[PDB]
Amino acid sequence: MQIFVKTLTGKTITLEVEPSDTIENVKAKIQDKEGIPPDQQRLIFAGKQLEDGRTLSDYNIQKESTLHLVLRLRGC
Amino acid sequence: LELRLKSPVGAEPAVYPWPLPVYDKHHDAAHEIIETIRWVCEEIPDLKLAMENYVLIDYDTKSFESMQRLCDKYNRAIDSIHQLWKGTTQPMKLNTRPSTGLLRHILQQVYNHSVTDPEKLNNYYGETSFDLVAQMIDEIKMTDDDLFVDLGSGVGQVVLQVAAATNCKHHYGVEKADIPAKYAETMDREFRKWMKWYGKKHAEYTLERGDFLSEEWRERIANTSVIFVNNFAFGPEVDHQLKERFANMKEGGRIVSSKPFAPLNFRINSRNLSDIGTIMRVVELSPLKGSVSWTGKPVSYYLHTIDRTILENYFSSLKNP
Amino acid sequence: AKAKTRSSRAGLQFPVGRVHRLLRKGNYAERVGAGAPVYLAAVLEYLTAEILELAGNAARDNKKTRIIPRHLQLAVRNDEELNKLLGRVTIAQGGVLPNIQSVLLPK
Amino acid sequence: AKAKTRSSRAGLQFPVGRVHRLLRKGNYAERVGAGAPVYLAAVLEYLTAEILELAGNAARDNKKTRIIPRHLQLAVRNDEELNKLLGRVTIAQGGVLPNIQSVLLPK
Amino acid sequence: HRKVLRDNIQGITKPAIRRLARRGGVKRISGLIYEETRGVLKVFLENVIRDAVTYTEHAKRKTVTAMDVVYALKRQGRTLYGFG
Amino acid sequence: HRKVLRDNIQGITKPAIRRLARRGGVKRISGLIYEETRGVLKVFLENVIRDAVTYTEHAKRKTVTAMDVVYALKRQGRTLYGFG
Amino acid sequence: KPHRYRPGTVALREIRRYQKSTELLIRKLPFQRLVREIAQDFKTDLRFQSSAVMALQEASEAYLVALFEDTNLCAIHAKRVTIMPKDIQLARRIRGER
Amino acid sequence: KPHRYRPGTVALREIRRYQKSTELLIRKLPFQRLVREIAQDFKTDLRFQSSAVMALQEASEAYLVALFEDTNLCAIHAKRVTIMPKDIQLARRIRGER
Amino acid sequence: TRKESYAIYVYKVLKQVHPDTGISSKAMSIMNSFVNDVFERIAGEASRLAHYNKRSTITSREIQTAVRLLLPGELAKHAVSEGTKAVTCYTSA
Amino acid sequence: TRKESYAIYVYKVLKQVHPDTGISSKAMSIMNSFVNDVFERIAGEASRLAHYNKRSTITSREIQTAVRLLLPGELAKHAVSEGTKAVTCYTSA
DNA sequence: TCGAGAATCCCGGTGCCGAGGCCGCTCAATTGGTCGTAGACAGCTCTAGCACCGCTTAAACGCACGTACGGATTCTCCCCCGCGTTTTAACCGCCAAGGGGATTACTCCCTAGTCTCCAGGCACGTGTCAGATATATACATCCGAT
DNA sequence: ATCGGATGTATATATCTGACACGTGCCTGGAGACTAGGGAGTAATCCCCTTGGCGGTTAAAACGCGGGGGAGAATCCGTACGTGCGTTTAAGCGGTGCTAGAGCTGTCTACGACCAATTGAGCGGCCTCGGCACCGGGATTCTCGA
Ligand SMILES: Nc1ncnc2c1ncn2[C@@H]1O[C@H](CSCC[C@H](N)C(=O)O)[C@@H](O)[C@H]1O
Structure with missing residues (x-):
């Protein structure tokens, strides 16, 4: 199915997803397709701060829907 | 004795003791009443229109009776222009936004009337203008x-x-x-x-x-x-x-x-x-x-x-x- | 055991293994605490990062994509703090900052 | 087994035992040869002998029999090579050499 | 209670800078020297005291030793004989 | 065979000292600068070479190598980067 | 007519006097208060050994009279005899401190 | 009438040429002969690695460049523009070398 | 004979702080000699700081005081910050 | 506790070279610090010399080269002559 | 072309407190062994430094010439020195408080050391791209003529 | 002031090239996993010594006033130094050749760390006087207006 990834500067990228795979896998594909670090990104949709071990369907975001992208400083 | 002048609109009246407030290097009560009177003067044009009357240079800090005369002039003036406000004549509206030097000396007025001893602030911070x-x-x-x-x-x-x-x-x-x-x-x-x-x-x-x-x-x-x-x-x-x-x-x-x-x-x-x-x-x-x-x-x-x-x-x- | 290098635990790029070996086999003191070579390699990696950043800026301002020694001298003699740390040093093939005294230019 | 000291074995005054202990415990190298502290205490004794001889001459010229620090400053500044060795140091309560520049004396 | 000295550099007075300059052998001292020499002495003391206070605060101490000032001068290449 | 060099301090030419002073930011050069700078360069090279030759006499070598010159200059304060 | 030395020879008499003696020139308590005032900025409530401010004073007078020797050579070099702030800044810019 | 530049601008073009460039401004083989002549006084029939001659050259000419900077500051301080041997002697006396 | 160097590490910090540029061999050996020189300065000050307090260790704190003495001002604050950041990232591993 | 010094040895060399002259306590401490500073310079140059050749020992050769490096000219000649005389007077006995 | 006020120096006189010699008492220097290893030395290899040659040509030398500049001169104002009166803070001596340095005892964590594994980095080899060089022509500018 | 001629330097493009950049075995140095010991953290306690506060004295600092002398400014002179130019020269490049010496490796012996037992050198602490600090006043040497 389809996903929208909204950036906070006003851009979206449309991507090929499976809801059965984890969101860590699609954020790895976000790394391979844009270069955003896995530690640095965080994706939220309607007050729902995602976790990497969970999948897309586990937080109930459907087809042709958008995840909002915001960044945090990585640290160690 | 005492020294009082009420607001130009009629709030709770400004009170001052007959003993002298001395606070800092640059902040005295005579200059305080001078700057407050002048900024109440600059806020309404009718006030400096009415009170240009015959009060020049001869006034000094501790001489309190000329202060009483001038503030009694201002008190009669406040009551009288309140009676001019009571008619059909519209005043300046209370809910307008103030000036810049007005807020500067209003903040220095709070600096006066709340902090008396700033060097007790030394017990350790500085001043932001x-x-x-x-x-x-x-x-x-x-x-x-x-x-x-x-x-x-x-x-x-x-x-x-x-x-x-x-x-x-x-x-x-x-x-x-x-x-x-x-x-x-x-x-x-x-x-x-x-x-x-x-x-x-x-x-x-x-x-x-x-x-x-x-x-x-x-x-x-x-x-x-x-x-x-x-x-x-x-x-x-x-x-x-x-x-x-x-x-x-x-x-x-x-x-x-x-x-x-x-x-x-x-x-x-x-x-x-x-x-x-x-x-x-x-x-x-x-x-x-x-x-x-x-x-x-x-x-x-x-x-x-x-x-x-x-x-x-x-x-x-x-x-x- | 899966061998994870001690520079990779700290996330430094400079080695702390080699810094630890130099601290031991240089005779600075008798014992070398384990928290010291990671600290020292962080400081060396930071100073290398600052001189390389100013050198890359001075090389890209000269429209070259390669750091020549002249770009290193133009880096460390312009920043006043690196000029104070590297005050005594001569960088070879380094050149001089172009600064002529304003007395010499004619009116 | 008569305890004949190494400071006396070489005809020196300076404590070759103490100089050897400082060379070992001071962490200069992982081992210190036996030829090291005799040589180093000889050099220290010679430099102390030259400084004390010149200070004694400078105190004898001032008709005093105690070497105060001012005589040490006159000793290390009047000679050329001790002034080159001690060029950085500031011998405390020592004063300077008495000389006025030639443009300042009246004419 | 507590205290802080507002501007205490004028203790290096004009006759003190004059005496120091007469020791070095100057014959006549312009009047603008004294502010410059107070600034130079303030920078030199700031450097030596900064290294001395660092040598002390390393050792978990609150008293700047004479050894700490001697090491702070030996660090900058101004070795001082007389205090250890 | 062998060769023995008489004087090559006149080989540091007048255009060489002119080029060095032009690098320093000097506009006019008096005519005695060439002799004084040959003297200054000879003193400096005597110091660096005396320390380098001592560093290479210690190691039982007969080639003053580049690390010996770099260590001599690191001893006199003029640390040299770019040779090891 | 009072007896008055010409301007220039009380200076040379002071030079001979302060060069031939070795005492400290700055008064000791102003220098101690200056050392405490400068050490106020790095760590507060620092105590000083008495020999520590004595060592700071020996070092600061030795540095200042060496700087005044250098600035006197600069002022003599400019065909003058009066040291000036240009001279002190030149000596410090040559010795590598500015 | 030939095209002649006012005395004082080929000097400034020379300054802007050599200050922006990183050559070795002394020629190499006279410097090799100078270094071997000076080194014959300390250890006879020595050899030199070529990198050591380049290290002695880069060090000596960078020292001479810094000396001419201090000398130019001395000469400008004396209200002149021409460095003179008393300016080099002053710069080496202030730096602590004579 | 393996003559070790800081070639590859200065190269990695270059490819971090400047993803385009590279470094010529003369400037490579200059940064080699610079890393060796700042190492010998900080280790020398740490050795003297260990000997002046009658300790026998170069711990992290002596390298921190050595960096506070040698590097001037803002380089001291930044290098102290980056050092203690790396040592606290190291100890929690 | 016991704070060691070179006081009595400087006193013995003073009594050798000037049999009637004494040394005040401040000049005693100045010669103490001078002996300590010259010992730290010669041992520092000897440690650097013994490390620069990848050796491990401060022999008499290293102290001789360090004294030849630090002291200028005639002091170096007289000091290495005094040192080699004392090391031969030591090793013969 | 010197006397007079005045610092500076010198010389005898008094007092003090820091050098200087003496004395128990630790603990660090000495001596006597043992053993691991580092340095001395022999020998072989093989880089590289010295030496030499000739060609090219960039650069150095010499030289005359003109001009800016360094140096001497004179003058002028201000400013810094010398002196005298006021004034103020240093300094000395003494006083107590208590903070923190110095020392000791205790305990355990951290690091040298060692033995084993393995991958990080280094010498080496090879492609190819950034830069150096050469050329060819636009802009910056320097300087004398009007 | 404005304005071209000549010059210099910068900007653009095509070229070679070699030095940087990256991939390959490989080997040794770094990581890891215990092991033991002592170095260092921590607490407690003694006591030196550092800060802070009296007052008395007074030398030194601050202020102010003439005033001379020195910094600086303006002017003038000539000469020493920049600039071209042509004439010399020797540096640089590019090869070849050698052997001297750096450098690596392979034994091996002297030597120095290490440790235990022994003792006197050198330490702190303490009398003890004498070299010098302070001092008083007179002779000597200036410095300057005569
Ligand atoms: N944790 C904290 N919470 C609130 N104030 C703090 C703080 N740490 C420091 N400060 C305050 O920060 C102040 C710095 S001074 C700033 C003055 C004031 N903000 C102005 O602009 O006029 C001090 O008063 C200090 O007490």
């Missing part, structure tokens, strides 16, 4: 939907400056040391009563005590957008914990500070991603540039703005060749 935050207001452009907060307000003078001068919904001020926050709650109450005395408009604001790195304050600064600090001597750990606190701010949030958290020649690259310099644009102002009392050369209070687009174009510029 109002022309600094005035040229900041010349630089910063703001709305109603954002929130103003200064962190480490001291006596809280700039809190009252922003709360009476411009229009955030909720202005905060914080102070952790016992003596300037101790004086600052009284400054809050007396500034409330002096805003009743002058009758000029001012929005919702508070003066609080606490450590602004606490767990409530973390999401509290993560709520607001407009922040002022004087971070010359906060220390390293305070500023770094505040950096990882301001990382959770929304778009367009603005910081004004003395020691800049990121130097203005910043370029982001794959080593310093953890720093807050990836988030902020840094611009420089031009204040009066003084403060020759301690160390101060010509230095500006640099403005940071949360700009998360430079990080985005760096991440997309990662795949150029």
